Amino acid sequence: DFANDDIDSYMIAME
Amino acid sequence: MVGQLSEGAIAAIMQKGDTNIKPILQVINIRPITPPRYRLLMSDGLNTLSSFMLATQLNPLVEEEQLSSNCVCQIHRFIVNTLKDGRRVVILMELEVLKSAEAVGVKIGNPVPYN
């Protein structure tokens, strides 16, 4: 789980 | 072996937002976010950056194990999405795996996280 930040949530919300 | 990677491409993406380049990068790690969405930690030899996302259309490259940790690939099309806080997400649209994970075998060089 590298870089477990809030970027995951952003990439989910994309597209 | 670091001469095989596009040293400085991560800084160019993060400073210039260049999308015309076709950088050669090493996959350091791939992890699914929960139909999976893959987030990639990539290296250009000099730096790593963790905000790469695989377009869904490239998921077969992961599913057939062509794209996996330690492989080297060349990006043929990507999009940048700059967040309100200034971080940049790099969406990989098209790429070619140049050297398999098995053939490379290890992280190339000693890249440090971009800042």
Author numbering:
A (entry chain B): 297 to 311
B (entry chain A): 1 to 34, 39 to 119
Which sentences did the original study use to describe this structure?
The heterotrimeric Replication protein A (RPA) is the ubiquitous eukaryotic single-stranded DNA (ssDNA) binding protein and participates in nearly all aspects of DNA metabolism, especially DNA damage response. The N-terminal OB domain of the RPA70 subunit (RPA70N) is a major protein-protein interaction element for RPA and binds to more than 20 partner proteins. The RPA70N domain adopts an OB fold with a five-stranded anti-parallel beta-barrel but has very weak ssDNA affinity. Its primary role is to mediate protein–protein interaction with its basic and hydrophobic groove and a side pocket, as first shown by a series of studies of RPA70N interacting with p53.
Previous studies showed that RAD9 directly interacts with RPA70N through a CRD motif (checkpoint recruit domain) in the C-terminal domain; mutation of the CRD motif affected RAD9 localization and ATR checkpoint signaling. We fused the CRD to RPA70N and crystallized the fusion protein in the P3221 space group. The C-terminal part of CRD forms a short two-turn helix, while the N-terminal part adopts an extended conformation. RAD9 D297, D301 and D302 interact with RPA70N R31, R43 and R91 residues, respectively. RAD9 F298 inserts into the side pocket, as observed for HelB and DNA2. Several hydrophobic residues from RAD9 (I303, M307, I308 and M310) pack with hydrophobic residues at the bottom of the RPA70N groove. ITC experiments showed that RAD9 CRD binds to RPA70N with a KD of around 20.5 μM, but mutation of F298, M307 and I303 resulted in a substantially higher KD value. The RAD9 F298/M307/I303 triple mutant pulled down much less RPA than did WT RAD9. In addition, mutation of the conserved arginine residues in RPA70N (R31, R41, R43, R91) disrupted the binding of RPA70N to RAD9 peptide. Our results, in combination with those of previous studies, lay out the details of RPA70N/RAD9-mediated 9-1-1 clamp complex recruitment to DNA damage sites.
